[PDB]
């Protein structure tokens, strides 16, 4: 669960609790996660935030049901995302939606992840 009063701090604590380069100490503390792959994660939600604004949840429930699968498939390919869908409770908090204002809050959580990822790195 992520609520409207905690999700940004959850997102900061998830981006910090995330692995880094142990070796290659020339410019250290660089993540084993790249900006392109995390923007690939946010691309899945950017075309649902607009329709969370526009139209009803009973046409977006199908697209959230496939959003679970999109996060599963991105978790399976690279191990960098695989240790981000667990740190950030993404698959846990994706089952927690059930309306519009939690879909919007989840998309804002993804943006908070991207924001703290740009801010650290």
């Amino acid at each position: 669960i992520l609520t409207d009063e905690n999700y940004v701090d959850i997102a900061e604590k998830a981006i910090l609790k995330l692995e880094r380069n142990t070796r290659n100490r020339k410019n250290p503390d660089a993540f084993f996660l790249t900006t392109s792959k995390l923007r690939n994660l946010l691309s899945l939600t950017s075309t649902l935030f607009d329709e969370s604004k526009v139209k009803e949840y009973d046409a977006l429930l199908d697209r959230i049901a496939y959003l679970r699968v999109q996060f599963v498939y991105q978790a399976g390919r690279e191990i960098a995302v695989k240790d981000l869908i667990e740190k950030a409770q993404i698959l846990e908090a994706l089952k927690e939606i059930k309306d519009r204002e939690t879909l919007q809050r989840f998309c804002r959580y993804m943006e908070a992840l991207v924001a703290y990822f740009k801010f650290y790195g």
């Binding site: 691309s43 199908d62 049901a65 496939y66 699968v69 599963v72 498939y73 399976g76």
Partner: protein
Amino acid sequence: NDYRTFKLSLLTLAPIHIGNGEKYTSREFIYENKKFYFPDMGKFYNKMVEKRLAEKFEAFLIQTRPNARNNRLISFLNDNRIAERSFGGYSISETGLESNSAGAINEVNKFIRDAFGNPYIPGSSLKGAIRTILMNTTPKWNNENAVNDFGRFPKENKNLIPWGPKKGKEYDDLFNAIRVSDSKPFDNKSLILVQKWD
């Protein structure tokens, strides 16, 4: 009426890909016949959560077996005997090239399409194409572009072509004056999915 108009006819010698930033993954197409079938995957997961196969699909997606023939979502359909392929989306027929363990292409980029699903070429694309031609063939715009040297020679000046409102001055803005429209949308029989070759 100072609006002198021009009509540009554009023939394609080479294949032209434009647009959209989206890409189908390696598990979001179907190659059954000589026709790559790109379905609406939300309806594809709707139809297949009803057949108890959603957990089996979640198992399929993280399943990196060898012989990429078995990793391209035809294998998920013919494996668990799914013959109803009635989903929204579109087919584009095969080139016959890019093969055999065929059909194992991986990530296609979708061409730019309007809301009806009919593809078109936007005029911002072709206006930028015109703009490089007009910049390069001008010995006023070649000279002093790469400027400021601060970050890492970072950017064009963007003012060798004078642009803006520009307080006090009259409004010139050359490339506001050239106005390229979009195209009437062609049909998606015209798309083929070439690969890339360096």
